[PDB]
Amino acid sequence: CAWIPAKPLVQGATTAQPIPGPVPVANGSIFQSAQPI
């Protein structure tokens, strides 16, 4: 009865790969902000 396939409570992926960030613009500044929310 413990061998019956079951759906977990937290479905899906339990990890997220950090997304690489945008390439800085060529404006002469060190501060570069990604597409602001």
Partner 1 sequence: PTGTNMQLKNVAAVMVTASYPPFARQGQTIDVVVSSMGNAKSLRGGTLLMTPLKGVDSQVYALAQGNILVGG
Partner 2 sequence: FGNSRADMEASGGNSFNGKGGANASNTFSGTLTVTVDQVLANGNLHVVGEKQIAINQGTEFIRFSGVVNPRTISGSNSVPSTQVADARIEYVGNGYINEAQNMGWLQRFFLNLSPM
Residues in the site for partner 2, rule: CB under 8 A?
A: 1-3, 8-10, 12, 14-15
CA atoms 25, 21, 35, 33: torsion sign = negative
Alpha-carbon Rg for the chain in angstroms: 21
Could you tell which of partner 2, partner 1, none binds residue 1, using a CB distance below 5 to 8 A set by kind? partner 2
E-assigned strand segments in 1-37 = none
Amino acid, single-letter form, for residue 6: A
Could you tell which of partner 2, partner 1, none binds residue 29, using a CB distance below 5 to 8 A set by kind? partner 1
Q: Is 36 in the site for partner 1 (CB under 8 A)?
A: yes
Interactions with partner 1, residue window 8-27 (CB under 8 A): 24, 27
